[PDB]
Short mmCIF file of C-alpha atoms in Angstrom, two decimals:
data_model
loop_
_atom_site.label_atom_id
_atom_site.label_comp_id
_atom_site.label_asym_id
_atom_site.label_seq_id
_atom_site.Cartn_x
_atom_site.Cartn_y
_atom_site.Cartn_z
CA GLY A 1392 25.06 -0.12 -9.53
CA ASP A 1393 26.83 -3.35 -8.80
CA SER A 1394 29.29 -2.58 -11.54
CA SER A 1395 32.16 -2.68 -9.10
CA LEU A 1396 30.98 -6.12 -8.11
CA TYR A 1397 31.25 -7.12 -11.74
CA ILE A 1398 35.02 -6.96 -11.65
CA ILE A 1399 35.15 -9.30 -8.71
CA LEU A 1400 32.87 -11.62 -10.63
CA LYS A 1401 35.41 -11.68 -13.40
CA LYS A 1402 38.28 -12.40 -11.05
CA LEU A 1403 36.31 -15.24 -9.53
CA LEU A 1404 35.70 -16.85 -12.86
CA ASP A 1405 39.37 -16.48 -13.67
CA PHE A 1406 40.55 -18.24 -10.54
CA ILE A 1407 38.05 -21.08 -10.90
CA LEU A 1408 39.00 -21.85 -14.47
CA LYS A 1409 42.63 -21.76 -13.46
CA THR A 1410 41.66 -24.12 -10.66
CA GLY A 1411 44.58 -22.87 -8.72
CA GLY A 1412 44.04 -23.14 -5.03
CA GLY A 1413 45.09 -26.30 -3.39
CA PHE A 1414 42.17 -25.61 -1.20
CA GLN A 1415 38.75 -26.45 -2.46
CA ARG A 1416 38.22 -24.16 0.45
CA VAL A 1417 39.41 -21.39 -1.78
CA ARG A 1418 37.13 -22.49 -4.60
CA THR A 1419 34.23 -22.68 -2.21
CA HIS A 1420 34.80 -19.02 -1.56
CA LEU A 1421 34.85 -18.33 -5.27
CA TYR A 1422 31.66 -20.26 -5.73
CA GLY A 1423 29.96 -18.34 -2.94
CA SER A 1424 30.86 -14.94 -4.33
CA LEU A 1425 29.68 -15.91 -7.79
CA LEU A 1426 26.43 -17.20 -6.38
CA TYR A 1427 25.61 -13.96 -4.67
CA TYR A 1428 26.54 -11.95 -7.73
CA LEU A 1429 24.28 -13.95 -10.01
CA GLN A 1430 21.42 -13.70 -7.52
CA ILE A 1431 22.00 -10.03 -6.84
CA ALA A 1432 21.85 -9.03 -10.46
CA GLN A 1433 18.35 -10.23 -10.94
CA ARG A 1434 16.42 -9.12 -7.96
CA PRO A 1435 13.44 -11.38 -7.86
CA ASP A 1436 11.58 -10.49 -11.02
CA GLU A 1437 9.61 -12.83 -13.13
CA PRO A 1438 8.51 -13.03 -16.79
CA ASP A 1439 6.16 -10.10 -16.33
CA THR A 1440 9.04 -7.72 -15.82
CA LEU A 1441 10.79 -8.92 -18.94
CA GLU A 1442 7.68 -8.50 -21.02
CA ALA A 1443 7.20 -4.97 -19.79
CA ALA A 1444 10.75 -4.07 -20.66
CA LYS A 1445 10.36 -5.43 -24.17
CA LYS A 1446 7.25 -3.48 -24.75
CA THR A 1447 9.02 -0.25 -23.67
CA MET A 1448 11.79 -0.86 -25.93
CA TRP A 1449 8.59 -0.79 -28.47
CA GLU A 1450 9.86 0.27 -29.85
CA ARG A 1451 11.83 3.18 -28.66
CA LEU A 1452 8.99 5.05 -28.84
CA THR A 1453 10.89 7.58 -26.84
CA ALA A 1454 13.70 6.78 -24.43
CA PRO A 1455 13.52 3.26 -23.21
CA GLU A 1456 15.09 1.45 -20.32
CA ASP A 1457 16.63 -1.89 -21.09
CA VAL A 1458 19.16 -1.81 -18.31
CA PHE A 1459 18.59 -5.08 -16.66
CA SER A 1460 18.56 -7.05 -19.90
CA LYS A 1461 21.83 -5.42 -20.93
CA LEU A 1462 23.44 -6.32 -17.62
CA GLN A 1463 22.35 -9.92 -17.96
CA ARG A 1464 23.84 -10.08 -21.46
CA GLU A 1465 27.18 -8.82 -20.29
CA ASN A 1466 27.28 -11.31 -17.46
CA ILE A 1467 26.41 -14.15 -19.78
CA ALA A 1468 29.19 -13.25 -22.26
CA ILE A 1469 31.81 -13.24 -19.63
CA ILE A 1470 30.61 -16.26 -18.13
CA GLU A 1471 30.60 -18.10 -21.64
CA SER A 1472 34.18 -17.82 -22.22
CA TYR A 1473 35.48 -18.58 -19.14
CA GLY A 1474 32.84 -21.31 -19.20
CA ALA A 1475 33.79 -23.86 -21.00
CA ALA A 1476 36.84 -23.99 -19.02
CA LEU A 1477 35.37 -23.51 -15.76
CA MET A 1478 32.47 -26.09 -16.30
CA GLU A 1479 34.87 -28.71 -16.51
CA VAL A 1480 36.58 -27.67 -13.42
CA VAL A 1481 33.32 -27.13 -11.43
CA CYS A 1482 31.85 -30.43 -12.19
CA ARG A 1483 34.78 -32.62 -11.37
CA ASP A 1484 35.52 -30.85 -8.50
CA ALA A 1485 31.97 -31.51 -7.52
CA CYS A 1486 32.25 -34.66 -6.78
CA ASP A 1487 34.75 -34.92 -4.50
CA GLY A 1488 35.97 -32.68 -2.45
CA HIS A 1489 34.43 -31.18 -1.50
CA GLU A 1490 31.10 -32.73 -0.22
CA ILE A 1491 31.71 -29.74 1.50
CA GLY A 1492 32.58 -27.06 -0.79
CA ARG A 1493 29.27 -28.64 -2.39
CA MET A 1494 27.07 -27.02 -0.80
CA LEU A 1495 28.59 -24.03 -2.27
CA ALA A 1496 29.21 -25.30 -5.82
CA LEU A 1497 25.83 -26.83 -6.40
CA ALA A 1498 24.16 -23.65 -5.40
CA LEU A 1499 26.44 -21.75 -7.76
CA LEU A 1500 25.62 -24.09 -10.58
CA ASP A 1501 21.84 -23.62 -10.00
CA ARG A 1502 21.92 -19.83 -10.06
CA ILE A 1503 24.07 -19.56 -12.84
CA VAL A 1504 21.42 -21.84 -14.37
CA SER A 1505 18.91 -19.73 -14.67
CA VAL A 1506 20.63 -17.30 -16.68
CA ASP A 1507 22.45 -18.55 -18.62
CA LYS A 1508 19.67 -21.18 -19.40
CA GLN A 1509 19.32 -20.98 -21.96
CA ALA B 547 -12.01 -23.08 2.99
CA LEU B 548 -13.33 -20.30 5.16
CA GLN B 549 -16.72 -21.92 5.32
CA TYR B 550 -15.20 -25.15 6.57
CA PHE B 551 -12.88 -23.52 9.06
CA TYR B 552 -15.85 -21.68 10.51
CA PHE B 553 -17.39 -25.00 11.57
CA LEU B 554 -14.59 -25.38 14.09
CA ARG B 555 -16.46 -22.91 16.32
CA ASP B 556 -19.38 -25.30 16.27
CA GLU B 557 -17.54 -26.92 19.15
CA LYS B 558 -18.16 -24.07 21.50
CA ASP B 559 -15.39 -23.41 24.01
CA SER B 560 -12.04 -21.71 24.08
CA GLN B 561 -9.14 -23.65 22.60
CA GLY B 562 -11.30 -24.62 19.69
CA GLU B 563 -12.08 -20.97 19.17
CA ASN B 564 -8.40 -20.14 19.05
CA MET B 565 -7.81 -23.12 16.83
CA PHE B 566 -10.36 -21.63 14.48
CA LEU B 567 -8.71 -18.26 14.63
CA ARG B 568 -5.29 -19.70 14.07
CA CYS B 569 -6.56 -21.71 11.16
CA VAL B 570 -8.05 -18.65 9.53
CA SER B 571 -4.90 -16.71 10.25
CA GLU B 572 -2.93 -19.52 8.71
CA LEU B 573 -5.26 -19.51 5.74
CA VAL B 574 -4.79 -15.81 5.06
CA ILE B 575 -1.08 -16.09 5.38
CA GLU B 576 0.51 -18.13 2.57
CA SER B 577 -2.68 -18.24 0.56
CA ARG B 578 -2.26 -14.52 0.19
CA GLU B 579 -5.80 -14.18 -1.04
CA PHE B 580 -6.11 -10.86 0.72
CA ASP B 581 -8.86 -9.26 -1.28
CA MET B 582 -11.10 -12.26 -1.08
CA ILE B 583 -10.33 -13.07 2.50
CA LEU B 584 -9.77 -9.62 4.09
CA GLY B 585 -11.72 -7.11 2.02
CA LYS B 586 -11.11 -4.38 -0.58
CA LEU B 587 -11.36 -0.75 -1.87
CA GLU B 588 -12.82 1.97 0.23
CA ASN B 589 -14.45 4.60 -2.02
CA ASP B 590 -14.93 6.08 1.39
CA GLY B 591 -17.46 3.47 2.56
CA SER B 592 -14.90 1.63 4.73
CA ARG B 593 -14.05 -1.87 3.59
CA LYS B 594 -16.14 -3.95 1.30
CA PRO B 595 -16.21 -6.96 3.43
CA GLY B 596 -14.13 -10.01 2.74
CA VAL B 597 -15.57 -13.43 3.36
CA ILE B 598 -14.01 -13.66 6.79
CA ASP B 599 -15.31 -10.26 7.80
CA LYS B 600 -18.75 -11.54 7.16
CA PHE B 601 -17.91 -14.04 9.89
CA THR B 602 -16.12 -11.15 11.75
CA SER B 603 -13.87 -9.89 14.55
CA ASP B 604 -10.10 -10.28 14.85
CA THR B 605 -9.21 -9.02 11.49
CA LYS B 606 -7.26 -5.92 12.26
CA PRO B 607 -4.50 -7.82 14.06
CA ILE B 608 -4.30 -10.36 11.30
CA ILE B 609 -3.89 -7.57 8.82
CA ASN B 610 -0.99 -6.04 10.66
CA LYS B 611 0.63 -9.44 10.83
CA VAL B 612 0.17 -10.08 7.14
CA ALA B 613 1.23 -6.58 6.19
CA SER B 614 4.43 -6.72 8.16
CA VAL B 615 5.21 -10.02 6.48
CA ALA B 616 4.54 -8.40 3.15
CA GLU B 617 7.19 -5.93 4.18
CA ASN B 618 9.70 -8.69 4.79
CA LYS B 619 9.12 -10.20 1.40
CA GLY B 620 8.95 -6.79 -0.11
CA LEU B 621 5.64 -7.61 -1.62
CA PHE B 622 4.75 -4.00 -2.13
CA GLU B 623 1.18 -3.56 -3.37
CA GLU B 624 0.13 -6.22 -0.94
CA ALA B 625 1.52 -4.06 1.80
CA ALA B 626 -0.24 -1.01 0.46
CA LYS B 627 -3.42 -3.01 0.12
CA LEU B 628 -3.07 -4.35 3.63
CA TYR B 629 -2.38 -0.97 5.16
CA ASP B 630 -5.43 0.48 3.48
CA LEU B 631 -7.52 -2.10 5.30
CA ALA B 632 -5.48 -1.37 8.40
CA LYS B 633 -6.54 2.19 7.79
CA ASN B 634 -3.04 3.42 8.35
CA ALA B 635 -3.53 6.18 5.83
CA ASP B 636 -0.24 7.87 6.48
CA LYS B 637 1.61 4.61 6.11
CA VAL B 638 -0.13 3.88 2.86
CA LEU B 639 0.85 7.11 1.23
CA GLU B 640 4.43 6.83 2.39
CA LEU B 641 4.88 3.34 1.01
CA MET B 642 3.08 4.61 -2.05
CA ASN B 643 5.37 7.57 -2.51
CA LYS B 644 8.29 5.18 -2.47
CA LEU B 645 6.74 2.94 -5.07
CA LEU B 646 5.87 5.76 -7.40
CA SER B 647 9.13 7.55 -6.66
CA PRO B 648 11.26 4.80 -8.02
CA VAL B 649 9.98 3.72 -11.39
CA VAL B 650 9.86 7.40 -11.97
CA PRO B 651 13.63 7.64 -12.22
CA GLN B 652 14.79 5.21 -14.90
CA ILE B 653 14.66 5.16 -18.68
CA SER B 654 11.70 5.98 -20.89
CA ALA B 655 9.05 4.14 -22.92
CA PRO B 656 6.27 3.21 -20.60
CA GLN B 657 3.24 4.33 -18.79
CA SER B 658 0.13 3.33 -20.66
CA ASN B 659 -2.68 5.52 -19.48
CA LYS B 660 -4.49 2.76 -17.73
CA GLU B 661 -3.10 0.70 -14.72
CA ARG B 662 -0.15 0.36 -12.38
CA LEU B 663 1.73 2.22 -9.65
CA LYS B 664 0.98 5.53 -11.23
CA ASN B 665 -2.62 4.54 -11.60
CA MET B 666 -2.45 3.38 -8.01
CA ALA B 667 -1.15 6.79 -7.13
CA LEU B 668 -4.09 8.44 -8.74
CA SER B 669 -6.52 6.16 -6.93
CA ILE B 670 -5.28 6.95 -3.45
CA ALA B 671 -5.00 10.71 -3.89
CA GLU B 672 -8.45 11.22 -5.29
CA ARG B 673 -9.69 8.82 -2.77
CA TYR B 674 -8.15 9.91 0.55
CA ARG B 675 -7.28 13.53 0.12
CA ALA B 676 -10.76 14.85 -0.31
CA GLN B 677 -11.99 12.97 2.72
CA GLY B 678 -10.93 14.18 6.18
CA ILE B 679 -7.37 13.32 5.17
CA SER B 680 -5.44 11.89 8.14
CA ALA B 681 -2.11 11.96 6.35
CA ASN B 682 0.75 14.32 7.05
CA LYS B 683 0.86 17.42 4.90
CA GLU C 699 -24.73 24.50 -5.63
CA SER C 700 -22.32 25.27 -2.84
CA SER C 701 -21.13 28.84 -2.66
CA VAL C 702 -17.53 27.76 -2.46
CA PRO C 703 -15.66 25.61 -4.85
CA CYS C 704 -14.30 22.17 -4.07
CA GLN C 705 -10.71 23.24 -4.21
CA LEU C 706 -11.46 25.87 -1.62
CA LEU C 707 -13.35 23.41 0.53
CA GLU C 708 -10.38 21.10 0.50
CA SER C 709 -8.09 23.95 1.35
CA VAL C 710 -10.10 25.02 4.36
CA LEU C 711 -10.59 21.46 5.48
CA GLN C 712 -6.90 20.75 5.25
CA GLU C 713 -5.94 23.86 7.14
CA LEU C 714 -8.43 23.33 9.91
CA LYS C 715 -7.33 19.74 10.07
CA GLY C 716 -3.81 20.82 10.83
CA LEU C 717 -5.07 23.10 13.56
CA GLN C 718 -7.38 20.43 14.89
CA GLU C 719 -4.55 17.97 15.22
CA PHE C 720 -2.33 20.60 16.78
CA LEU C 721 -4.79 21.50 19.48
CA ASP C 722 -5.79 17.92 20.02
CA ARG C 723 -2.19 17.01 20.64
CA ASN C 724 -1.40 19.83 22.99
CA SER C 725 -4.81 19.99 24.57
CA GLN C 726 -3.52 18.82 27.92
CA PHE C 727 -1.44 21.92 28.33
CA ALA C 728 -4.26 24.36 27.61
CA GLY C 729 -7.16 22.82 29.50
CA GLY C 730 -7.34 21.35 32.94
CA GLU C 769 -11.06 32.29 38.42
CA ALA C 770 -8.66 33.44 35.75
CA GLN C 771 -7.06 30.06 35.26
CA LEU C 772 -10.34 28.23 35.00
CA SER C 773 -11.77 30.87 32.75
CA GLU C 774 -8.82 30.39 30.46
CA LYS C 775 -9.52 26.68 30.60
CA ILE C 776 -13.12 27.14 29.62
CA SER C 777 -12.36 29.53 26.82
CA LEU C 778 -9.71 27.30 25.34
CA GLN C 779 -11.94 24.30 25.66
CA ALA C 780 -14.63 26.15 23.79
CA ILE C 781 -12.30 27.17 21.01
CA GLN C 782 -10.95 23.69 20.54
CA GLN C 783 -14.43 22.30 20.35
CA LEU C 784 -15.18 24.96 17.78
CA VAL C 785 -12.22 24.01 15.64
CA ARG C 786 -13.28 20.39 15.65
CA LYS C 787 -16.85 21.34 14.83
CA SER C 788 -15.75 23.33 11.83
CA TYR C 789 -13.70 20.34 10.81
CA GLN C 790 -16.81 18.21 10.88
CA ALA C 791 -18.88 20.58 8.80
CA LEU C 792 -16.14 20.96 6.24
CA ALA C 793 -15.74 17.21 6.20
CA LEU C 794 -19.36 16.76 5.30
CA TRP C 795 -18.99 19.27 2.53
CA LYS C 796 -15.92 17.50 1.28
CA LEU C 797 -18.23 14.51 1.00
CA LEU C 798 -20.96 16.40 -0.80
CA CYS C 799 -18.59 17.69 -3.40
CA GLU C 800 -17.96 14.20 -4.64
CA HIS C 801 -21.18 13.85 -6.47
CA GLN C 802 -24.90 14.17 -7.26
CA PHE C 803 -25.53 16.72 -4.55
CA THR C 804 -27.38 19.21 -6.71
CA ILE C 805 -30.15 16.94 -7.88
CA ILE C 806 -31.14 15.90 -4.40
CA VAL C 807 -31.08 19.46 -3.19
CA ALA C 808 -33.57 20.63 -5.75
CA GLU C 809 -36.00 17.82 -5.12
CA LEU C 810 -35.70 17.87 -1.35
CA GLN C 811 -36.27 21.49 -0.54
CA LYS C 812 -39.74 22.26 0.87
CA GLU C 813 -41.19 24.94 3.12
CA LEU C 814 -38.14 24.75 5.34
CA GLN C 815 -36.18 25.63 2.21
CA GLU C 816 -36.17 29.34 2.83
CA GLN C 817 -34.43 28.75 6.11
CA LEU C 818 -31.96 26.42 4.46
CA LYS C 819 -30.89 28.77 1.74
CA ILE C 820 -30.10 31.54 4.10
CA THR C 821 -27.77 29.39 6.10
CA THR C 822 -24.33 30.73 6.65
CA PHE C 823 -21.15 28.76 7.14
CA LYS C 824 -21.10 29.88 10.73
CA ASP C 825 -24.55 28.43 11.00
CA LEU C 826 -22.96 25.12 10.16
CA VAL C 827 -20.02 25.96 12.38
CA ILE C 828 -22.49 26.35 15.19
CA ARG C 829 -24.81 23.74 13.71
CA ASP C 830 -28.43 23.50 12.73
CA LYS C 831 -28.55 19.79 13.37
CA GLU C 832 -31.94 18.58 12.28
CA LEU C 833 -31.91 19.69 8.68
CA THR C 834 -28.48 18.31 8.04
CA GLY C 835 -29.44 15.02 9.56
CA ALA C 836 -32.37 14.69 7.23
CA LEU C 837 -30.30 15.67 4.23
CA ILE C 838 -27.49 13.31 5.14
CA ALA C 839 -29.97 10.51 5.53
CA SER C 840 -31.15 11.22 2.03
CA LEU C 841 -27.59 11.22 0.78
CA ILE C 842 -27.15 7.74 2.19
CA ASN C 843 -30.60 6.45 1.34
CA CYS C 844 -30.19 7.59 -2.18
CA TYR C 845 -27.40 6.17 -4.30
CA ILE C 846 -25.34 9.35 -4.34
CA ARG C 847 -22.83 8.47 -1.67
CA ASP C 848 -20.33 6.04 -3.02
CA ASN C 849 -18.62 3.34 -1.04
CA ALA C 850 -16.48 4.64 1.76
CA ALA C 851 -18.24 7.94 1.85
CA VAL C 852 -21.55 6.35 2.74
CA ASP C 853 -20.03 4.39 5.57
CA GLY C 854 -18.69 7.63 6.96
CA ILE C 855 -22.04 9.36 7.14
CA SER C 856 -23.66 6.42 8.83
CA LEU C 857 -20.82 6.63 11.29
CA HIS C 858 -21.49 10.34 11.61
CA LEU C 859 -25.19 9.97 12.16
CA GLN C 860 -24.43 7.44 14.81
CA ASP C 861 -21.79 9.52 16.48
CA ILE C 862 -23.28 12.95 16.41
CA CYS C 863 -26.85 12.60 15.35
#
């Protein structure tokens, strides 16, 4: 389980919101770690998987598995808080500096994006 | 598409022939229409020919190529399907054991009695084991 | 119907298969005058193991389906000979009858899919 990874994910969000780090270089690292974490959590699965899980829950006929959905929910809560704060930081940042760090931050924004889509 | 690619041979000579082969190979790959293009289900009785097979020949090498690629992507099912055509029976079961093995461990509420990896498991066993089974014990 | 059950047929087939593969793999050592006599004897045994494999394989096939109906309809004057056929008789084959029967299995609908292809292969190879 990438539970241990979860803690790093939290630290990353913390640093970003704080926007400490004179270096965007630092923030690029934070963005990269977050990107992998978001991607890692949902191994490529598509709506079919979600539908199957819901049915199984169907209702807990017996013992269901709803592990991946639960993991996504926890990620999304953490992310929310930290989120408003950090969204501000991530976008402004965007522009400038780092045309570089950019490659990293835009990718982070897009992954995040699916999840927390909605 | 296959019908059109086949015309390429109409210009008889090497080069064109390879171009044809490459085109078909390219078609199979990325279209991923394996059943249609390559073939399907044994029920003993080898392959039921795919459209290309009707045209014929290099088909085994293409399968290995596609199957390996499936492995990269991790498109299991496609790999199993491809290996069946490849007739690598041992490989099929092994990939198969892996697929069934996970999905077994997990949490409960599943397994309708009609279709999936388990069902897939049933198909292969009934299918191969009775017949001159080439797989490892 | 066959004297032995399907489960048993599969068991024998599987076991012989293991032996067949074993000998096939280490055939070089055994084959290739006392030494020559040993060579001949071993060659004969290995051929025998494979032959049994083939007979059992056919039976594995037959077990799948609609064997009984064809048998009843098919059997003629030759039938008496057929019924008193032992497994060893198949082991050391009575080729013509089986060929006819197998042809009927294929000609008729009974063989399904992959099986059918296999007999045609068989008739071609050893028939």
